[PDB]
Structure 1
Amino acid sequence: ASPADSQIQFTRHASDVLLNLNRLRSRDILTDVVIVVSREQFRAHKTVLMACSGLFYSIFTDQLKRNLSVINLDPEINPEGFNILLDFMYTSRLNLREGNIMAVMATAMYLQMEHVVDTCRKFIKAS
């Protein structure tokens, strides 16, 4: 048996994987859900959503909901805030601005993305 700890580490592999998953999203390859946010909608991979959000983890882990192909978010959720967070999921880069911080933060609370909410709080503290 081989403990992963003594194995050879590839320091860019995880980031390469995420970039390639984002490339598949951009080509709509093997996306399996549409997220509807008021008048807008965004396709994604459920696995990535689950990996990044407590809300999506809790939805899709439940066998009752695992096969859903459409999720309607709460009508109060800002589509721009959601789009910023979806991009973050697939890139590790978060577009916070003075003009979007409150919407992004509220959306991250709803999506149960605790480290992102904490970063939003730090953005507030620094402005």
Structure 2
Amino acid sequence: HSTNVLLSLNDQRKKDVLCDVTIFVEGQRFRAHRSVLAACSSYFHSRIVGQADGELNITLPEEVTVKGFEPLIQFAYTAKLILSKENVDEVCKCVEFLSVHNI
């Protein structure tokens, strides 16, 4: 299945190699690919599709928080989340949203 493709891409991502798009949050660099973030978050396709460069450097507003941000990519990849009751509000949109996000 294509989920095998997704899991293989995930494992490749979790080696810091074959990573194409790099996210920067107040210094932390989170590496990932080019196609998948385009498929996931509509704020990202905006900054991606307009270039054909080699190495990309996309920064996110202070509005998006790191603590909720790590599971966002995880749910983009494997559609499984871990979360407790203290960090919910800055994620309560259930259509992801959280970014701009007037659709």
- TM bucket (normalised to shorter chain) is 0.7 to 0.9
TM-score (norm 2): 0.79
Q: 85, 90, 93: which one pairs with 2:72?
A: 85
- SS of alignment partner, residue 93 of structure 1: coil
| Alpha-carbon distance between aligned partners in 1 of 2:100 and 2:30, rounded to the nearest angstrom | 15
The count of corresponding residues between Structure 1 and Structure 2 is: 99
Counterpart of 2:23 in structure 1 is: 35
| Structure 2 residues not aligned, in runs of 5+ | none
CA deviation after TM superposition for structure 1 residue 110, in Å: 0.1
Alignment of 1:62-81 (within 5 A): 62-63=50-51, 66-67=52-53, 69-81=56-68
Uncovered stretches (5+) of structure 1, i.e. residues with no partner:
1-12, 115-127
Pairwise CA RMSD of aligned residues?
2.3
Q: How does 1:88-127 map to 2 (within 5 A)?
A: 88-105=75-92, 108-110=97-99
Deviation at 1:19, TM superposition (A): 0.8
- Tell me the alpha carbon deviations over residues 68-109 of structure 1, each in whole angstroms, 9 at most, x when there is no partner: 611111123211111110111111112233122122347742
Aligned residue type for 2:74: D
User: Does the 8 Å contact 1:85/1:108 carry over to 2?
Assistant: no
8 Å CA contact retained: 1:38, 1:79: no
- Give the Å deviation of 1:111: 6.8
| 2:31 alignment partner AA | R
* Paired residues for 1:50-69 under 5 Å: 50-63=38-51, 66-67=52-53, 69=56
Do the aligned residues in 1 keep the contact of 2:19 with 2:33 (CA within 8 Å)?
Answer: yes
